[PDB]
Amino acid sequence: PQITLWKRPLVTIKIGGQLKEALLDTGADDTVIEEMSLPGRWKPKMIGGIGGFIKVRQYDQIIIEICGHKAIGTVLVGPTPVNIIGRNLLTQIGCTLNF
Amino acid sequence: PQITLWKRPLVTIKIGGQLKEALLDTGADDTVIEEMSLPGRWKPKMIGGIGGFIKVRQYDQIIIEICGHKAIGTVLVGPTPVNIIGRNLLTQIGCTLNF
Numbered sequence: 001p002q003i004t005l006w007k008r009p010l011v012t013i014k015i016g017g018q019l020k021e022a023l024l025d026t027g028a029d030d031t032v033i034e035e036m037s038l039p040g041r042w043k044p045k046m047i048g049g050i051g052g053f054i055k056v057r058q059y060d061q062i063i064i065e066i067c068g069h070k071a072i073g074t075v076l077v078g079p080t081p082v083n084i085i086g087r088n089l090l091t092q093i094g095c096t097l098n099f
Numbered sequence: 100p101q102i103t104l105w106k107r108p109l110v111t112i113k114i115g116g117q118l119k120e121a122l123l124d125t126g127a128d129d130t131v132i133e134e135m136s137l138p139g140r141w142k143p144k145m146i147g148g149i150g151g152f153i154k155v156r157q158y159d160q161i162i163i164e165i166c167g168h169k170a171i172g173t174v175l176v177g178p179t180p181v182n183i184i185g186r187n188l189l190t191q192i193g194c195t196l197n198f
């Protein structure tokens with residue numbers, strides 16, 4: 001699809017058997033999801049930007065379905081104000097910026 | 100152009116006759132740049148990021164060139180980690196997400 005930017009580019013995602021709304025964010029290096037359980041090992045990480053830093057749990061090799069496109073990658077889980085799909089997963093679905 | 104997301108989508112912008120590097124961010128509602136001098140009056144604005152909210156200075160009808168495309172709009176100035184081009188200006192330059 002072609003997504004215009006008049007409003008926030010929110011899409012439905014499927015992760016860990018759950019349906020969630022997430023923002024497609026080209027400014028994000030990583031994907032960050034609100035508190036939820038994920039299977040496997042994890043390691044602590046700090047991520048930051050506007051307003052400072054938050055502590056998150058880093059889970060690797062997690063499958064996410066974004067607009068019917070399956071992608072696998074690292075997913076950070078923590079107290080984010082919005083679920084963010086970052087570049088690590090946007091590349092996998094072949095998402096590009098065009099103008 | 101078509102910009103892939105394997106690397107950060109950093110572009111050259113020109114504001115107040117100076118060249119600066121900025122990130123094209125579909126996850127940002129507004130454009131925020133690091134401390135600099137801008138003309139006219141400013142209004143108060145709060146923007147929320149991953150770590151919480153910060154106060155910024157809102158300047159309207161600012162001339163800015165983004166990757167060679169002319170835009171005229173709202174520019175926020177504050178303690179941002181990197182210069183960010185948000186949806187208010189990405190819409191002006193005709194930017195869309197595609198997959």
Ligand SMILES: C[C@@H]1CN(S(=O)(=O)c2ccccc2)[C@@H](CCc2c(F)cccc2NC(=O)CC(c2ccc(F)cc2)c2ccc(F)cc2)CN1
Nearest residue numbers: 027028048049050082126127128129131146147148149183
């Ligand atoms: C990764 C980059 C950099 N920042 S960041 O916090 O530094 C950061 C996020 C992760 C990892 C590193 C850095 C974000 C934009 C922040 C931003 C600007 F820069 C300039 C102007 C406005 C804003 N804020 C918004 O537009 C609000 C928005 C939002 C999006 C991501 C957030 F995390 C927090 C809040 C929102 C969306 C839906 C909702 F329901 C509630 C809020 C996202 N893109």
Ligand SMILES: [Cl-]
Nearest residue numbers: 072073074088
């Ligand atoms: Cl990854």
Ligand SMILES: [Cl-]
Nearest residue numbers: 091094103104
């Ligand atoms: Cl590619």
Ligand SMILES: [Cl-]
Nearest residue numbers: 172173187188
């Ligand atoms: Cl504007």
